[PDB]
Amino acid sequence: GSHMGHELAKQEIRVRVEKDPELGFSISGGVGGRGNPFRPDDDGIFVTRVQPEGPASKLLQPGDKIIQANGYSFINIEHGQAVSLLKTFQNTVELIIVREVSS
């Protein structure tokens, strides 16, 4: 796993980002996708950057794993599909994320 001999606690969190009109964060990942620096063997979609003083600054953090966005599943999704879907979203994006919480 990502950590040697232990696994961090996980919290599922629901947040709403108001696009302004941009997301205010960047992603990487996906099945057969661009990878990620958090859980490198996990093919999920991860937040890689959060725009300072942007619409996600109080809500998201690097390393958050997006598992659902506006009712669409981001599990087994490809990078391009995730990017395309996020792009179609006009204003509010309701995300379900998994955040690792160190002890």
Instruction: Tell me the domains of the chain and their CATH numbers.
Output: 1-103 (2.30.42.10)
Cis peptide before 21 (omega within 30 of 0): yes
Structure tokens at 55: 């619409």
Q: Are 62 and 47 in contact (CB under 8 A)?
A: yes
Compute the distance between CA of residue 80 and CA of residue 70 in angstroms, rounded to an integer.
17
Structure tokens at 31: 């099945």
Compute the distance between CA of residue 71 and CA of residue 67 in angstroms, rounded to an integer.
10
Q: Are 77 and 30 in contact (CB under 8 A)?
A: yes
Query: What was the structure determination method?
Result: X-ray
Structure tokens at 56: 């996600």
Q: Are 17 and 25 in contact (CB under 8 A)?
A: yes
